[PDB]
Design a protein around this nucleic acid. Structure first.
Length: 71
RNA sequence: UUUUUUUUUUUUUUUUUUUUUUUUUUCUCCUCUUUUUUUUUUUU
């Protein structure tokens, strides 16, 4: 959310993403569009679980629809 | 009743060349609560 992105900097490489089912951990991905996609669902995948992190790493895949409209 | 003389617009043209997007950082990060997980069935 915004008040916790304006504090990430403005070139915040690393970012944390919240999944949609409670069964899945949170994922560490690196993007540079976080301050203009705070009203959309997105999609990611997974390449490698690393042990120097408590979470698994990822990377963005494609955009999805908008939060609020049935589509 | 007033003669004679005092040059002018730099000369030159017939020289070879075998490279190539970019370029250089920013750390670790507490996801709150009825559950085992329901399940046949038929009309698309």
């Amino acid at each position: 959310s915004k008040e916790e992105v304006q504090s990430q900097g403005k070139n915040a490489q690393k970012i944390l993403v919240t999944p949609w089912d409670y069964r899945i951990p949170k994922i560490r991905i690196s993007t540079q569009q976080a301050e203009t996609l705070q009203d959309f669902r997105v999609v990611v995948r997974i390449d490698s679980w690393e042990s120097t992190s408590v979470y698994p790493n990822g990377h963005f895949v494609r955009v999805l629809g908008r939060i609020g409209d049935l589509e």
